[PDB]
Amino acid sequence: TTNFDQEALLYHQQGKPGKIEVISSKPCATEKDLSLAYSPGVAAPCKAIAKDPAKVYDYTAKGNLVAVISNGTAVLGLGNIGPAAGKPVMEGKGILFKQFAGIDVFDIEVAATDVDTFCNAVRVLEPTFGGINLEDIKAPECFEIEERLKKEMNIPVFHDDQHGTAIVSGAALLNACSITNRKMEDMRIVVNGAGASANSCAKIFIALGARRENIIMCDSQGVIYKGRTAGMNKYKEYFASETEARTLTEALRGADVFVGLSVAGALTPEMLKDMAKDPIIFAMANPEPEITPDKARAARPDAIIATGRSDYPNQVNNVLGFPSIFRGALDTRSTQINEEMKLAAVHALAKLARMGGKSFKFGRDYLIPKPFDTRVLLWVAPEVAKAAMKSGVATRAIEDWDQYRESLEAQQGPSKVFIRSAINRVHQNSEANGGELPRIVFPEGTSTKVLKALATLVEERICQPILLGYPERVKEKIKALDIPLLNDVQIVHPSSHPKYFSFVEKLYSLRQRKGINLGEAERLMADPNYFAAMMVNMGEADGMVSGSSINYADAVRPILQTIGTYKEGIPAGLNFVLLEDKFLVLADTTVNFNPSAEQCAQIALQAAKIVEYFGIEPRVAMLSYSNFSGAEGTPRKMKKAAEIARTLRPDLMIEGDMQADTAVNPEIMERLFPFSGLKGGANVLVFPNLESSNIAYKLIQQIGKAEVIGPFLTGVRRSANVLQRTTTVDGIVNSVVFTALEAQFIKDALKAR
Amino acid sequence: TNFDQEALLYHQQGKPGKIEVISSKPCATEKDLSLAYSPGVAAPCKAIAKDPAKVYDYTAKGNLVAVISNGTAVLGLGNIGPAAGKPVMEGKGILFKQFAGIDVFDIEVAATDVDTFCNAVRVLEPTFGGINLEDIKAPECFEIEERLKKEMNIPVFHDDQHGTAIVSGAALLNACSITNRKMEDMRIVVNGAGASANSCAKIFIALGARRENIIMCDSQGVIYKGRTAGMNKYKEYFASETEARTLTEALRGADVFVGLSVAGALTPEMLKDMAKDPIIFAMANPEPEITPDKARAARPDAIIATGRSDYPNQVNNVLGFPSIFRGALDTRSTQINEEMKLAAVHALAKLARMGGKSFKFGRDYLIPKPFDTRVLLWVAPEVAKAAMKSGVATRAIEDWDQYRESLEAQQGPSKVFIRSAINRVHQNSEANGGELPRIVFPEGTSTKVLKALATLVEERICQPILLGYPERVKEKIKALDIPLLNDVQIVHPSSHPKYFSFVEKLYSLRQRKGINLGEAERLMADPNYFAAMMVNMGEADGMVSGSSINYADAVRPILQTIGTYKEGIPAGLNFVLLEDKFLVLADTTVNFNPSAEQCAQIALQAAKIVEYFGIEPRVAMLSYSNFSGAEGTPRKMKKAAEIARTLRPDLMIEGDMQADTAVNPEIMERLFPFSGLKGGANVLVFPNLESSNIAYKLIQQIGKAEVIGPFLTGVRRSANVLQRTTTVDGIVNSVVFTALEAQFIKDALKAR
Ligand SMILES: CC(=O)SCCNC(=O)CCNC(=O)[C@H](O)C(C)(C)COP(=O)(O)OP(=O)(O)OC[C@H]1O[C@@H](n2cnc3c(N)ncnc32)[C@H](O)[C@@H]1OP(=O)(O)O
Ligand SMILES: CC(=O)SCCNC(=O)CCNC(=O)[C@H](O)C(C)(C)COP(=O)(O)OP(=O)(O)OC[C@H]1O[C@@H](n2cnc3c(N)ncnc32)[C@H](O)[C@@H]1OP(=O)(O)O
Ligand SMILES: CC(=O)SCCNC(=O)CCNC(=O)[C@H](O)C(C)(C)COP(=O)(O)OP(=O)(O)OC[C@H]1O[C@@H](n2cnc3c(N)ncnc32)[C@H](O)[C@@H]1OP(=O)(O)O
Ligand SMILES: CC(=O)SCCNC(=O)CCNC(=O)[C@H](O)C(C)(C)COP(=O)(O)OP(=O)(O)OC[C@H]1O[C@@H](n2cnc3c(N)ncnc32)[C@H](O)[C@@H]1OP(=O)(O)O
Ligand SMILES: NC(=O)c1ccc[n+]([C@@H]2O[C@H](COP(=O)([O-])OP(=O)(O)OC[C@H]3O[C@@H](n4cnc5c(N)ncnc54)[C@H](OP(=O)(O)O)[C@@H]3O)[C@@H](O)[C@H]2O)c1
Ligand SMILES: NC(=O)c1ccc[n+]([C@@H]2O[C@H](COP(=O)([O-])OP(=O)(O)OC[C@H]3O[C@@H](n4cnc5c(N)ncnc54)[C@H](OP(=O)(O)O)[C@@H]3O)[C@@H](O)[C@H]2O)c1
């Protein structure tokens, strides 16, 4: 097993067994609350439901809970493994459910291998569950089970295989047809394979506007022809086309859309020559796609390529369809899931792809929205609800949409989507630039944490790393760590680069009158930190990430000495604390020992600019130990800093001084100090000295369940970032992601000048 | 209906459910998605293919029970349907999680028929690691229990019958063993041997009783031979030899009276006719069967242990199912065995028989209070012993020390710290003749203070001496509609009989510090100064203030009047109660910029409090550098750590560190293995006021941990100052700990 395999194995091993747990929604520790929960004060909701049964949806979590039910017979690529071993997949499905829609998930791995036991056992769980997701059931049992369940149950039932990927496939097909200006009246599709996904795709395409005679079904044995005596399954013979294309090679003559859903290797360049004008190719059977996009473009440049892998664009992911469907169904309190909801979802996905703080560009490489696009939910969950306003079988029938919009936004706070949006923005910036990752120089080439994070960063295509150090030693360390992904990395020895002496001359010219001459300049450039700073300054790299193996002072001194600050800029750290519904920005945590009022105001302005880059209105607060006291010492300095920042940036909302609770709690400020101009809480917090900010952010990172990312060195001319020496692998990954974002922004700003 | 509306908020409150499901493992990134979803999620699956039992090592099956039901008998109500019973099942689940740390699902089976219910629960076997099916109808409960025990391996447990049996046996064994009678030969009569009483009688006969040695008289008369009224196939398991039918003749009141059903049937004439030492268990209906006062008045020589929460000797299921099911789960036990039931009842009896002290085992402490922390820590290991002895646990058994460590970790400070503080307050009050500490509140006309005082006086913690106008505060109390405050003591500072003596003593204290008789008379009108003088002169045990005014103006009179003891420095002490440990931040209120000696003294004081709370203190002098010793704060922190080490050479106090290095053992061991601090630091000493204040306030607000404080340490007497931005529950916690400190200081002053 590789390093990733071992990490995945230990993912469910370390700490508490499993991944999911059940906790009280609100705190319950007091004896009065315990009596409210144990003494017969909890019988009152039962009596309330007694007079109104359906009202239970508002009297419990049933309306916000989804079953995830499987028998362990179609677990990914494992085939039949039994319900016992199908538990971690259900846990992962529930994790994805909560991540992408915010719905509580109950994973039930029922041991009903027989169809009758499944049907007569699932039906009895109806009154206590708000919706069921069937999955991981092998054919042909799954089709019959779902068909019986849909009629025999009065609450929505969804199958991730019978109505799963086919929604994203239909959205991609709609976008491809719009690109090719071809209507659904005369379209040719050959759905290779005879699995659940193939039949689901065929059914939804037929219900979408395709003609059943035009479409054909192909499998391992061959194309189902008229009067076929092989494959006596009812579902297989249902999608039987009267033709003579049993041969695989000749079955694709004049094929408008490949939509291939068979194992890898079923497509060849000679086979690719058999497609019709402007064909569309779909991958299948991860992790090996049906055909590589590069060879498809080389052989047939007029074609359109869609894949099921993260590496190549146009990723068909099953996570785009189910979470929004279920969120819309439950919030609208729908009593069933019909084809109208799925068609509405397909239309919404196609519309979103056709048309944080930015988006992609419509084209041949963007037919469906990326799975990391949060707006997906906001653009398809209401639409399903819209279908619930027309199709029917839905109670409640919410009359508002903005309230629904903000309710949906409440379930996608920064703690869930901030890093995902940052990585998506990095990908958008790289792809819009031609497809080159920013060059990030790592002075610590022989650092275990840096290399272990570089494996993930290279796999995720975030940055192009340039490790500094002796090539032999870093290669030995990579081989010892067993990372078969950094073997092709670029390693640059400091005193071997062709531009090394140019860097020495540049540093000598910069600081000739600051205590450095040629003899000292060469020795300084021998250091990896100074060489990395010079590389970043001179344009040989976009950014740099150092300080993992040394203290912050001697890791940030070369950056300030070489790269320096820009006009009217002060170097300053900056941390993002990603809470449930907001992210706070603490500044500064790393550089300034005891900033004055002017320095505090400048730090506040820099932090506000960084916040505004992310599309969030900044509200600065000058933290202190006193609430608008203005007394001698820190309160006076914070008051003066707030006034200076207000004069510099009048349109903002700055106020000081105040304590942390007054700043970050709008209710406290409104109740106690209604005169202050800061309304709604503060997302930017400027600290009086270094000890306060450093200790506060480290304590929040350690003992607080919230996640902090940083510190990021702001106020420097180029994109230089220093990691805290106590960082972890994930901290390095996040910091490198945001360093790549900053480097791309700085490079784009430089170019557009 | 706000009590129901509280759960309706729990059902809306930006959260539409009483319970919710979160992810213990992180899920925020594409790598995390690959780890949790396909194709990475296939990697553990192939691991489980070799051995199915490895699910207990991979998935959350081990810590997963369910409250299965059908709504046939839900709480104090008859048949209601599976749909309408969900809130009570969710309450059972949250009780499970709170008192045992067990994740629990809420499944309702919409089937009154036995066959479908049994089929569904049997087929849910690999889904769940344990079954706590509860609130099903009877006597079909016996049938479903037997069928499920015979069908699948995982332990099926009916909470009602067996938990009632365990609690009844625990209350009965100690009572019988102290009444000069035996539970095996002396003819006990009891009341009931059916449904839950059937399990009660089975537990009794397993604990010494029998069918022939013990004559059983039922709640529904008697289930002996003859009369066939209200008979079923599962009732004659305890036929007796008494041949009478009427309660007067069938029941002669021989040894005990354990009623579990039917309305109140206990007459004073019958209690007089009872032979000797009436042991009465009158849980029965949701409503009390017979009130304990009437039964006690009927027989003065009677020892009555009712089964209601309104009276002492409480009987509850929280001493039953949680600990025993935790024990069964931890060993991956197969099915449910009687031996574990007798082990649990013996553990409860021993715990009942054997902070500062505990309530005397007499007529009031037959069983401990049904929320005590030691209950689980005692019952669960014994249930594990029984499960191992019965040979039903497939999983191997390790040393019991690690098991006890895990059981203790199941209930960290965040769940039990305030409750244990309240219990210690009550124990100190009981050990002091029932007197409560007198706490004087300078702000007698503060809405938050009065609202918190309602709960504080309802919980019997402190005695308010609210200062201010005797009429204005009464008007405020009437406006806020708090009845319990109608009997509190209101003192006008300028009209108290001891006002002039206090003025004279204040003038004597600070005659050479800018205060003369006129200025002392002017200052004693201040409620803060008067409360401080009251505490200093012993007329009140403690005081809390600052809920409306800023900290400086609220703490200056305390420092000027009460002062600091020898070798003491005033400091603010905050407790951050995390899931596994509690940190102590100091100082957060007073010292603008303490020096090395001041920081060392603050650390010593904080270590003293931590030692008082029964935890080994580990001190860390926080800074922005990691053992750098550079000019400025790092050098001051290093010097302070050295001074504190020389002062108390038995604690582990380590240099200057960042917060992450201090509170994380892994970072400390990996980066700085040359240090003397091991296992993390539970005491943090900050270099200045801004750092500590901002850190504690930010942790309180944006963190998910509970911060209680700040507490004023280093003063001669008990006197705390609340934060201006405090809430009602914060005031409640601060007053609880102020009362605890006042009791400790009064006890210290009583001697010498
Ligand atoms: C995540 C963590 O680990 S946080 C740890 C806490 N932080 C620390 O321990 C480090 C705190 N900072 C410091 O100790 C220092 O201020 C350092 C390391 C930034 C600089 O060391 P110093 O001896 O003060 O300065 P140094 O000689 O390196 O100065 C380098 C350059 O920075 C510039 N500089 C430093 N601070 C500032 C500032 N606030 N504004 C503008 N320029 C500045 C100087 O002008 C100088 O430029 P020059 O070469 O043209 O003269
Ligand atoms: C994306 C995130 O997460 S952070 C988002 C932050 N949002 C913002 O709006 C950031 C605000 N702006 C900034 O931080 C910066 O000032 C930026 C991004 C505008 C970049 O400013 P820069 O382009 O680096 O300024 P710079 O001073 O280098 O450019 C002016 C010229 O002076 C030159 N120059 C100035 N000082 C020096 C020096 N010491 N040595 C050499 N050249 C110098 C530069 O080479 C440049 O010349 P060029 O354009 O021919 O190459
Ligand atoms: C929870 C929150 O909101 S925390 C808010 C942040 N904290 C604050 O704003 C308050 C910080 N503390 C202070 O400002 C001051 O130190 C105060 C208010 C406590 C008192 O300091 P001063 O106002 O200078 O005191 P003052 O001159 O009135 O004397 C008061 C007494 O306190 C004593 N005292 C004050 N600080 C100390 C100390 N660190 N050690 C010993 N004694 C002390 C003085 O000796 C004096 O006693 P004395 O009259 O017998 O000589
Ligand atoms: C419980 C928690 O959570 S925190 C745990 C840790 N807490 C602590 O350590 C708090 C410490 N608080 C205390 O009171 C200390 O334990 C003590 C008892 C040692 C302090 O002693 P003090 O309160 O200073 O009193 P002291 O020992 O001086 O009293 C002896 C005599 O001096 C007299 N006295 C002392 N100071 C004065 C004064 N200013 N004016 C008049 N008489 C005085 C007392 O009247 C007493 O006389 P008596 O024998 O006739 O009764
Ligand atoms: N969007 C996605 O990335 C996505 C979504 C869902 C599922 N999946 C993948 O789908 C798989 C599970 O579902 P499935 O229905 O695809 O399983 P599957 O039915 O086993 O997939 C292959 C089947 O297609 C037929 N087939 C056609 N041409 C074939 C050929 N040349 N070689 C072999 N078989 C050929 C065979 O069926 P006959 O023997 O009956 O002819 C074969 O059993 C997993 O790999 C899962 O990851 C991917
Ligand atoms: N130890 C505990 O914490 C504990 C235990 C149990 C109950 N309670 C409390 O008691 C309430 C629940 O009541 P419950 O009925 O489930 O438990 P219960 O009153 O202790 O059980 C008595 C059972 O006997 C039967 N019975 C026979 N005659 C009866 C009569 N006249 N009235 C009532 N029942 C009669 C009923 O079963 P049939 O309907 O099958 O005859 C009933 O379920 C809740 O408030 C709950 O909190 C607490």
Side-chain angles (χ1 to χ4, degrees), chain B residues 565 609 612-613 715-717 741 744-745 748-749 752:
Chain B
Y565 45 63
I609 286 87
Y612 174 75
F613 276 108
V715 278
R716 281 189 26 245
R717 304 275 170 264
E741 175 187 18
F744 168 82
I745 286 197
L749 256 58
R752 106 164 166 179

Side-chain angles (χ1 to χ4, degrees), chain B residues 538-556:
Chain B
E539 300 268 319
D541 300 340
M543 60 162 299
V544 350
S545 59
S547 100
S548 41
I549 50 190
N550 69 110
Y551 199 94
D553 295 324
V555 85
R556 203 175 272 122

Side-chain angles (χ1 to χ4, degrees), chain B residues 205-273:
Chain B
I205 70 167
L207 275 161
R210 271 300 327 273
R211 251 187 63 124
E212 35 203 2
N213 303 341
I214 286 322
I215 298 204
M216 181 305 278
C217 289
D218 210 74
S219 53
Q220 205 48 235
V222 48
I223 327 286
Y224 84 126
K225 314 284 286 196
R227 180 220 85 182
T228 50
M231 281 305 138
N232 50 72
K233 217 197 184 299
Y234 312 90
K235 250 197 171 181
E236 306 91 343
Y237 295 142
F238 293 97
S240 53
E241 292 85 48
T242 170
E243 299 305 283
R245 165 89 204 100
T246 308
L247 162 69
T248 60
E249 43 172 329
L251 171 56
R252 311 308 305 186
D255 280 44
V256 291
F257 177 74
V258 190
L260 279 66
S261 64
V262 192
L266 193 53
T267 63
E269 43 100 349
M270 187 38 197
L271 217 35
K272 192 88 47 198
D273 287 347

Side-chain angles (χ1 to χ4, degrees), chain A residues 566 609-610 613 717-718 741-742 745-746 750 753:
Chain A
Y566 54 77
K609 290 219 287 286
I610 273 149
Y613 171 79
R717 282 191 321 113
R718 298 308 201 250
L741 242 185
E742 169 175 21
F745 170 77
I746 270 170
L750 266 158
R753 203 178 58 180

